[PDB]
Amino acid sequence: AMFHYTVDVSTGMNETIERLEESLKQEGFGVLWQFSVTEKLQEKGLDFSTPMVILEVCNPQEAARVLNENLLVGYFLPCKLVVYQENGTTKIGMPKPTMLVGMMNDPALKEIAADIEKRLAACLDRCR
Amino acid sequence: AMFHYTVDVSTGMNETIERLEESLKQEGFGVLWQFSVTEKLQEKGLDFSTPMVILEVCNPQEAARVLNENLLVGYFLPCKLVVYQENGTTKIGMPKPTMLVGMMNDPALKEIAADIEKRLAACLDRCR
Ligand SMILES: [Zn+2]
Ligand SMILES: [Zn+2]
Ligand SMILES: [Zn+2]
Ligand SMILES: [Zn+2]
Ligand SMILES: [Zn+2]
Ligand SMILES: [Zn+2]
Ligand SMILES: [Zn+2]
Ligand SMILES: [Zn+2]
Ligand SMILES: [Zn+2]
Ligand SMILES: [Zn+2]
Ligand SMILES: [Zn+2]
Ligand SMILES: [Zn+2]
Ligand SMILES: [Zn+2]
Ligand SMILES: [Zn+2]
Ligand SMILES: [Zn+2]
Ligand SMILES: [Zn+2]
Ligand SMILES: [Zn+2]
DSSP states (O other): OOSEEEEEESSOHHHHHHHHHHHHHHTTOEEEEEEEHHHHHHTTTOSOOSOEEEEEEEOHHHHHHHHTTOGGGGGGOSEEEEEEEETTEEEEEEEOHHHHHHTTTOHHHHHHHHHHHHHHHHHHHTTO | OOSEEEEEESSOHHHHHHHHHHHHHHTTOEEEEEEEHHHHHHHTTOOOOSOEEEEEEEOHHHHHHHHHHOGGGGGGOSEEEEEEEETTEEEEEEEOHHHHHHTTTOHHHHHHHHHHHHHHHHHHHTTO
């Protein structure tokens, strides 16, 4: 299936990030790190002009939950979200936790990933 | 179809991170951010006692290359590496770039990911 979940939002980059942080907070997720990919590359004189910001988010209890079931899940932490502007429109997307964890061949872990995916998806929908 | 590439090292957690940072640098990869999952969870009072540190690394030129091939690859950036200890032995692992982008059904992108994967794995091998 589609490896990612992406939504179109009416707001610009800055306000989208603002609203996403509030939506995540409502769900117990905190932003651990924000990285402006576009800035990092353009500062190096590289040719990449699409505005794009990557956010590493985390809900401590959810992290502990998955790590205590399978240590290798750390290879997919923290949860990643990406806010970018394509064709003059802003979007928020994320690789699906169930697709990432699915590669691990751990049925039970994938079901916990599904809970996480549902919550992150809800956070994204609130930003439409 | 192992989703990850992991190596055992003889060094302790801190020395290992130091050696990995150097190995990465020699290959043009800089550490953008890192954090101790263990400290974070224990700080929150949760039960997780396995030493584990996650590093987000970047080689700007390589990032520009995949992003310009397919924007959605941003959903898998920056490159992730994990240093952790199991049964008293330190290990360094990474989810395979080829496995991650493989879900995108994009042969051209996967070829670039294979190039990046080989280089990152070399960095890991050099810490043994
Ligand atoms: Zn603006
Ligand atoms: Zn505002
Ligand atoms: Zn903000
Ligand atoms: Zn700037
Ligand atoms: Zn900069
Ligand atoms: Zn989490
Ligand atoms: Zn259990
Ligand atoms: Zn939950
Ligand atoms: Zn629900
Ligand atoms: Zn929805
Ligand atoms: Zn395995
Ligand atoms: Zn250091
Ligand atoms: Zn460092
Ligand atoms: Zn080399
Ligand atoms: Zn890179
Ligand atoms: Zn190549
Ligand atoms: Zn090359």
